Paper text:
DprE1 is the first of two enzymes that catalyze the conversion of decaprenylphosphoryl-β-D-ribose (DPR) to decaprenylphosphoryl-β-D-arabinose (DPA). In its natural context, DprE1 catalyzes the oxidation of the 2′ hydroxyl group of DPR to give the ketone decaprenylphosphoryl-2-keto-β-D-erythropentofuranose (DPX), with flavin adenine dinucleotide (FAD) acting as the oxidant in the reaction. After BTZs have entered the catalytic pocket of DprE1 containing the reduced form of the flavin cofactor (FADH2), which was generated by oxidation of the substrate, the nitro group of the BTZs is reduced to nitroso which can then form a covalent bond with a nearby cysteine residue (Cys387, Mtb enzyme numbering). We obtained co-crystal structures of Mtb-DprE1 with BTZ compounds 1, 2, 9, and 12 and BOZ compound 5.
Compounds 1 and 8 are the two-electron reduced forms of 7 and 12, respectively, also referred to as nitroso. We were interested to compare the kinetics of inactivation of DprE1 by 1 and 8, which do not require activation, relative to the BTZ counterparts, 7 and 12, that require reductive activation. Unbiased difference density maps, calculated with phases from structure models prior to incorporation of the ligand, demonstrated that all five compounds formed a covalent bond with the active site cysteine (Cys387). The nitroso-BTZ 1 bound in the same way that CT325 did, corroborating the ability of CT325 to serve as a BTZ substitute. For instance, the planes of the BTZ scaffold of compounds 1 and 5 enclose an angle of 15°, with the other three compounds in between these two extremes. The complexes with BTZ and BOZ inhibitors induce partial ordering of the 315–330 loop in some cases (compounds 1, 2 and 12). We used the nitroso-BTZ (1) and hydroxylamino-BTZ (2) as positive controls, which demonstrated that a +343 Da species is detected by mass spectrometry and therefore any trace of this species, if it occurred with 11, would have been observed.
Residue numbers in the entry: 7 to 45, 48 to 268, 283 to 319, 330 to 461
Write the structure that this text describes.
Amino acid sequence: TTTATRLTGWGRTAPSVANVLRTPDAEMIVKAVARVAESGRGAIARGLGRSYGDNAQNGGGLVIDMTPLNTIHSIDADTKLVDIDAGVNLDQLMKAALPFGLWVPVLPGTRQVTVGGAIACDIHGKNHHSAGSFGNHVRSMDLLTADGEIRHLTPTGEDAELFWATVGGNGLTGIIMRATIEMTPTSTAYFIADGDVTASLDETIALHSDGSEARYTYSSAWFDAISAPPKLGRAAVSRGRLATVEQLPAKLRSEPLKFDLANKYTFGPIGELWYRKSGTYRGKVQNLTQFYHPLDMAGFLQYQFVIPTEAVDEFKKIIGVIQASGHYSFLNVFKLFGPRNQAPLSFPIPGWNICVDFPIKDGLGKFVSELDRRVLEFGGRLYTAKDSRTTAETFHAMYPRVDEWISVRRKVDPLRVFASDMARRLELL
Ligand SMILES: Cc1cc2nc3c(=O)[nH]c(=O)nc-3n(C[C@H](O)[C@H](O)[C@H](O)COP(=O)(O)OP(=O)(O)OC[C@H]3O[C@@H](n4cnc5c(N)ncnc54)[C@H](O)[C@@H]3O)c2cc1C
Ligand SMILES: O=c1nc(N2CCCCC2)sc2c(NO)cc(C(F)(F)F)cc12
């Protein structure tokens, strides 16, 4: 079913109309690409549309919806390998793999993302400093390339260059049809978590520098970006690891792999004490929602960037520029990222990662451009999955291996068959 449809990112801006093919037939998808390879607005895959930007739309072009390709082919507990269609979402995968004592190795902050989208944006999670990003756990993928052929890529094979170009490649090397992922063994669906509350930016940084991070596989913090210094950058830090069966309480040991406001006090000293109490704890047993999606149970601009580890002073500065700006962000996530991977367009690098969420109002666009500049000057970068407004020139300087990447893309799609709004804006075409 080919249908002219109006598509936007999760942020619901920069709308664009395209011919949306939605089919469960992989043979239909190979033909639509062959067709597009004849006649020149190109094609692009789309997952669940959870990316905020314009990387999954192609104005006046073809957009292939991959979510009907959602078959899990096999799960093997001994090898820890799952073999799945690209349109399988990580929530679906999570529930399918638990009974085998397997855990999805990298989870983002929403489980409604496809494997293809997980690979194409090379997503990260609370465990990046211990496990890397999603691409590090893919052992193979089958990629529908511009020549109508389906190539079988692996991280260390002869096609390693193309594999790593596809990881974080935002769909611009072809369609990931199928992949094999190595899962993390687990005896439990639960976490054991430690909580800590800091009073300032310099404490937060101290906590993340003292060596405690190495004792936790998962870590992230809620972060104050409004309150002026000294309060600026105080945080609720939440850290932990998957629980073993031995560490669960009686009630949960029979089904260990299961899954199924303001008052007058709030802003005074009693609230400060209460919040400090609630956010301080040791060895709390917690399920996925409680630990990983604590938010559970349009008109905003999402902005995420990472600054190199060494440039700690420069990070403090950027955070100060944000609270002084008049633009207030209430929901902020902070994390120290670990080592990077071989993918040239992969976002994560070791250093200070922060996500902020600004209300759309007058002055924002021009303030965010100036932020881009500070982020660039300080050796950091923005995340494509959260962006629709940065310039090609900024992007290119932020990702110095883009040229290396462009070369790989030139060989595999010399006719520019795969294209998107983002590719044209960021001049990756
Ligand atoms: C509330 C929320 C929280 C989030 N938290 C995080 C987080 O913690 N960490 C993180 O890293 N990201 C996070 N994200 C971003 C999200 O993980 C990525 O945007 C992800 O790529 C979206 O997956 P999707 O399946 O919706 O892909 P879409 O948004 O539909 O597409 C995204 C990109 O993947 C490509 N693509 C999709 N399918 C295929 C395929 N089969 N073959 C080739 N290319 C394909 C598209 O062409 C496009 O370039 C979050 C997003 C939201 C809305
Ligand atoms: O857990 C997360 N939840 C998020 N969302 C749900 C709550 C509301 C806003 C979106 S965003 C996010 C980001 N930024 O993208 C980074 C990290 C990380 F650094 F990996 F720890 C975690 C999250």
